[model samples]
Target: QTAPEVLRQWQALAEEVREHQFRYYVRDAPIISDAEFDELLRRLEALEEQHPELRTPDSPTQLVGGAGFATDFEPVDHLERMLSLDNAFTADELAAWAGRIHAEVGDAAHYLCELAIDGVALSLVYREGRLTRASTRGDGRTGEDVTLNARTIADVPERLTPGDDYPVPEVLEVRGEVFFRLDDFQALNASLVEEGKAPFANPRNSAAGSLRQKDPAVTARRRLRMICHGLGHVEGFRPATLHQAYLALRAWGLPVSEHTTLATDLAGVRERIDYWGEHRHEVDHEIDGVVVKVDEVALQRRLGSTSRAPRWAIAYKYPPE
Candidate 1:
């Protein structure tokens, strides 16, 4: 109840949260589960709420994901800055996000729902339909240059194929996840153990480690895969909705989720979340939640984004399963 007591508690919680964030974001070595991390964040936010002096612009809660620290690879800026999504861990939190979306753009807006894959976020740039650059989501604006490593990913297309419905864009930036399939991860760990090397802790970390290999040939041999989930800077070709953009991505020979669904209302969005929460194991890649996005491009613009995350989208993260 005392201010001094609260101050010490807040400081301790904030420091712990930062350490976890650094490990997860920079080191790719998370000792805690996603749910545990969320709980820590929630506790810090609550403490800050009760003591406004503890809340600062530099606080982890205010920042977008994590800081882009020095790395061996070249650092490059994204054409359009990448942002992380605000997480909703419970149904009530999910409902609150829906409420905010409806309040911003009204009830007529539809939703685009997709599995939130537990993988490393990547930005791939294409100029004249030819893959030119690739990077990791280091902070938000800047990322580690991984073009050579990305080219080795078979799922990543080197050139776009024009279709009757939509031609290639002059400039395009696709955002997606790079992950290791269950079997691939197991095979990798088995090989590592045989070589007397330490095995990866999980598929997500294994994907991060594999993608960051110094040699692209080593990366290719590891068999990293990517799936297009969102867009960044785009020109020439325009889509009215995100779903439409996914179609164009597919036509251009990019890999997108076949399980993506269009929800007509919040009720439908909730239904999909429940469905995926139950059937998440059905997918080859590890999925931790469902991402709900405002479908219409116009509505998304109207809603805009915070300094950290898009106001038009929310990730309904399922509790550890």
Candidate 2:
């Protein structure tokens, strides 16, 4: 169902947003400051909140539900809500996180420790064993479709691994981080400055800027990489544990970070965190923190989440450098 007046306004706003996206994301030249652009996006969101019956919300320049999208990147809803993790900045906070879990689930625990790579979150979808949609983690419930750009990454598989034991699902959603290697980021920034322009802010910022550009060609040349950290909706066999799913993702040919380790207790979690803290300078990728997660899916589900973040997972961030 649709309304003529509402659709007209929506279309007009969409076009305006498209122009802004081109200026800001594609060319790195902005007609409006970031705040003004955010205001425009927020206004568009208000309209959507006021009217869904009047909107189709995916075509044109709607990034999920409003007047914001890269030209080719339409909008798609996530099958499951992509969640944010709560943070623990100190050891005391980390202990509290574990103690809370222990109060309910008891002392028995197996934790998964992973480098929290500083990057953009992405969701890649596969249908009938073929990659169908590649999306951003926009608002977590819906995202801007970037299939064309995502397909450019050699690391992003356009086809799932085909086999009997490790069969691809009828429909699968893979969630992960799209990041830049330290060397690549540095070279890219130097290259941009080499060709004569302002320096890119930093590694993660520049990488995200390129990854979400209107032009997939630009994204391809940027040399962005991805690694699966979690799963979304699936129509297939279920893996019992997060650790198993991590391994399964790797076997399916999607990269799951290699530094991920299994820890049996809170002390083990701290050990991994401290180890990475000292050696964080040694890694090739930018990781601001370590992510600690309960290994079992059932326990994670039971632990649940708040309105904004998950309960089963905690991100232990290093103090600012």
Candidate 3:
């Protein structure tokens, strides 16, 4: 009755999806890629909608949803879509991307290179120099509100301070990575193991779980840190280059990376990438790659972007040691 075969399939998929979630969230490891997990979850959601009784309180689909649950974080739309970067696994791939940059913007453009922190992406919105909202980069356009958790981090400025060189923007949306320092990550894992809790697999995974805690106090106790890396939506001031924007962010009392470098050409870009790859372990925080960007704001606009990523930037992924 009521397609018993379909019901059996739904039950099997639900159990499988629940197992994956436990592995991912509680165990800090996932057997399937995020895309694959999403597809499975979507299928479960579709089946549940067709059978109202399937939407029980203890159902796998009921525990989480597109907008999240009542006890979970609420969804908030980003003013501007967060763009992910294309990845380059080898020098050849980097050069090929560099060729695209050269063809689009010519030889005059300088590439901006920064360490790609192995952490979660966060969007911080400031209105009239005060921190207004903060969120996770969910599906690029909509994200979960984590404003309270973000506020607890000491590095995040509650109010912007203007300097002589730059005035506070009337509206500013900055992008950053929330990460755990290697030392702190190790210590936290040790403590969790001692307490008989499941230890996190990596700094990135730990930082993500810490940020999503229901209690901000729990998040604050994790000793999380952040560094601003990109300009999202901005008004009241415009920067000619990404580096110029960094200088402004620094002036306004936001945390910016001192290690960011400007490369005059493709050769220079490669040089910085090699240097970082060699010295990757020396950094306090975990870095998985190097983000290279075309510096000129004008060139970035001209190059435009794909639906998912920017044409002007690429992340040169480091080979695992």
Model 1: colliding residue pairs:
none
Model 1: per-residue lDDT, tens digit, 25-114? Answer: 644557799999999999998877877876787787765445623335798999996999999999998878888888888988899999
Off by over 4 Å in 2: 1-71
Q: Per-residue lDDT for 1-321 in model 3, tens only?
A: 368887798889988897676545533447799999999999998988887777877788895632222225799988898978889999998878988788878988899999999999999999999888899999999999988778778789878997768988999999999999999999999988999999999999999998998756567677889999999999987999999999899999999998999999998998999999889889999888899999999889999999999999999999986
Q: Whole-model lDDT, candidate 3?
A: 0.87
lDDT of each: 0.87, 0.80, 0.87
Q: TM per model? A: 0.77, 0.76, 0.77
User: In model 2, what lDDT does residue 184 have?
Assistant: 88
Query: RMSD, each candidate, Å?
Result: 18.9, 11.7, 14.4
- Counting only residues 3 or more apart in sequence or on different chains, how many pairs clash (N, Cα, C under 3 Å) in candidate 1? 0
- For model 2, state the Cα shift of residue 135 in Å: 1.3
